[PDB]
Structure 1
Amino acid sequence: THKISDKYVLLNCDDHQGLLKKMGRDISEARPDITHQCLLTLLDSPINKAGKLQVYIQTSRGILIEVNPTVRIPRTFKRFSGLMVQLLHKLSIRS
């Protein structure tokens, strides 16, 4: 996540030209879309509905997130972005 002055965002390859280059990193490594579309696939797979799966993720910055089977991850992308901002800063999300 990152500040704009007033606003917090999740770092994309597309919400910026060079916020990642100001932070030092390269823009090709700021891809939350692919963990979004993995999380959608795993939580719409039938094994998750049958209850034989749980999804842990771990950020490249070394942050481990446990993902319940009962969650409904939002289908569009920036809804997931606004979910990830509050998850990363409040460390918890209720139903």
Structure 2
Amino acid sequence: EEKKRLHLIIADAELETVPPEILDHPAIVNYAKRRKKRPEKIILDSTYHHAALRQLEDGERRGRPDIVHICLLNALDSILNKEDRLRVYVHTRNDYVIYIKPETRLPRNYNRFIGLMENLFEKGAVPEDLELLRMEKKTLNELIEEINPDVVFIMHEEGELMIPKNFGKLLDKFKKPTVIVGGFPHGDFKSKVDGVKISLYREPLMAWTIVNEVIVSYEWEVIKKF
């Protein structure tokens, strides 16, 4: 825990159980009936639950646990992760953080991932002994305080434009760089924290693409055998 590592936060993520406001919406009730599950225990998924989101605040961007899934598959299966050069976290839109042990094997199947998220939200930590995933009430600033990095970067389409290769070289100049990528499909961050905004392209990209550019660019600097 003294070697250089990237601390990557997928932040303001659209990962939540079904909003209390819409628990009785027919599309929710029908879905939960079919799944034989209590609605309040179910992970919100706009693919199934869109009809119920029409009237919800930010309804159009909520319920995107797919973004976290694909980001985490990309991050945890990375060479950077295997070389013990990555720590990854999820901060959700409702100010919960998920801590992930680096050795975690995330379900490749999305539906199995959702099942895992349902278990995590219910029990607070999974599995019982290992606690490969652990969740608690926490703001993005509180998380950053815990990491105590020497620099915070916020990946932002409007930030300082950098060639991805060059951003990797920049990250390798720090001991404990934190990079924040939004876990939401469009719009602004909800959590304004101090950090350096960095663009890698002058068009919007998906979170997983940004994850890949950052991780791969860093890999080729920080792993001396590369």
Q: Give the alignment's TM-score, normalised by structure 1.
A: 0.86
Q: Deviations over 1:44-83 (max 9, x none)?
A: 1101011111111100010011011110000011100000
1:79 is the counterpart of 2:109: no
Secondary structure of residue in 1 paired with 2:61: helix
Q: 1:10 matched to which residue of 2?
A: 43
Task: Map 1:5-84 to 2 at 5 A.
Answer: 5=33, 6-7=36-37, 8-21=41-54, 24-25=56-57, 26-84=59-117
Distance between the aligned counterparts of 2:115 and 2:60, measured in 1? Answer: 20
1:89 is the counterpart of 2:122: yes
The alignment covers a number of residue pairs equal to: 94
- 5+ residue gaps, structure 2, are 1-16, 24-31, 131-226
Distance between the aligned counterparts of 2:54 and 2:108, measured in 1? Answer: 29
Displaced runs of 4+ in structure 1, greater than 4 A?
A: none
When Rg is computed on C-alpha atoms for both structures, the one with the higher figure is: 2
Distance between the aligned counterparts of 2:42 and 2:62, measured in 1? Answer: 16
RMSD in angstroms over aligned alpha carbons? 1.8
- 5+ residue gaps, structure 1, are none
Percent of counterpart pairs with the same letter?
Answer: 36
Secondary structure of residue in 1 paired with 2:47: coil
Aligned AA for 2:44? L
Aligned AA for 1:66? Y
Q: Give the alignment's TM-score, normalised by structure 2.
A: 0.39
Secondary structure of residue in 2 paired with 1:57: strand
Distance between the aligned counterparts of 1:42 and 1:78, measured in 2? Answer: 19
- Structure 1 residue 30 displacement after superposition: 1.5
- Structure 1 residue 33 displacement after superposition: 0.3
Secondary structure of residue in 2 paired with 1:61: coil
Distance between the aligned counterparts of 1:56 and 1:39, measured in 2? Answer: 9
